[PDB]
Ligand binder design. Structure first.
Ligand SMILES: Cc1cc(I)c(O)c(C(=O)Nc2ccc(C(=N)N)c(Cl)c2)c1
Lengths: 245, 13
């Protein structure tokens, strides 16, 4: 996240950190995700597409730091890794960029609630906040586009949703943005999601609940003027989510 | 009653 503040998992208890094992010994961060129900985390298919080997990923809940442990964190293996079959990537956009990971611990259980682990709500079919709503994004992604490392502390920031009309202006993303995407930016193009934030949540209040309105998907640069962050529009995938969970 | 019921989506504690 470019801008924002550092936070702790208590402020985003549904955030999931996904890592990959290289049996040479290292475990590297891949993407973020969000806990939907005790056994399911949702992220982005582009995070897994290149290495769909579920056995090589580890999912952690209750984590405030990237490589050090947080007291209360829970570690899970991926029992099922569902990627969207119509996932496509083009010159910028990723279409149908949503993925589901069914998690299981070594004891064979799913997540348990704690002050650091909570689920986030799903919107109702095709229901979104209106553009102008301020939503927050969280993640361990880059703080500057030129960095090659990720922060160790979790960060969060606020962005506002903008209209498709505005995001589809030729000088923004044109028709790269579809109705199955949402665009969010900071009025001053100062804070935004960046590399490493993929898979994470765009949370907005909807009907009184903190709802998972988007999944960090793609963007040109990070915090670039007229280059919003594009998120998968969760509200438009509810049938898909329900069919697999 | 079973742990799961304690999840309240959207709540921070
Ligand atoms: C190779 C790679 C890997 C990961 I994981 C990414 O998140 C990205 C990436 O470009 N993420 C990325 C970068 C910028 C933005 C933005 N808001 N402008 C967004 Cl949504 C996502 C790239």
């Amino acid at each position: 996240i470019i801008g924002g503040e550092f936070t702790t998992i208590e402020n985003q208890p549904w955030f999931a950190a996904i890592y990959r094992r290289h049996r040479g010994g290292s475990v590297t961060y891949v993407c973020g995700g969000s806990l939907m129900s005790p056994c399911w985390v949702i992220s982005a298919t582009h995070c897994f597409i290149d290495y769909p080997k579920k056995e090589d990923y580890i999912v952690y809940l209750g984590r405030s730091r990237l490589n050090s442990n947080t007291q209360g964190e829970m570690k899970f293996e991926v029992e099922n890794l569902i990627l969207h079959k119509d996932y496509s990537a083009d010159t910028l956009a990723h279409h149908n960029d949503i993925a589901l990971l069914k998690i299981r611990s070594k004891e064979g259980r799913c997540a348990q609630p704690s002050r650091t682990i909570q689920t986030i709500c799903l919107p109702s079919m095709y229901n979104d906040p209106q553009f102008g709503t301020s939503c927050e994004i969280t993640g361990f992604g880059k703080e500057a586009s030129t960095d090659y490392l990720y922060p160790e502390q979790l960060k969060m920031t606020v962005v506002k949703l903008i209209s498709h009309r505005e995001c589809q202006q030729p000088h923004y993303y044109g028709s790269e943005v579809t109705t199955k995407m949402l665009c969010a930016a900071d009025p001053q193009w100062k804070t935004d999601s960046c590399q490493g934030d993929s898979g994470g949540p765009l949370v907005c209040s909807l009907q009184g609940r903190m709802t998972l309105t988007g999944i960090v998907s793609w963007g040109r640069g990070c915090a670039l003027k007229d280059k919003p962050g594009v998120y998968t529009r969760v509200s438009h995938f509810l049938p898909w989510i329900r069919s697999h969970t | 009653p079973p742990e799961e019921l304690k999840f309240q989506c959207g709540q921070k504690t």
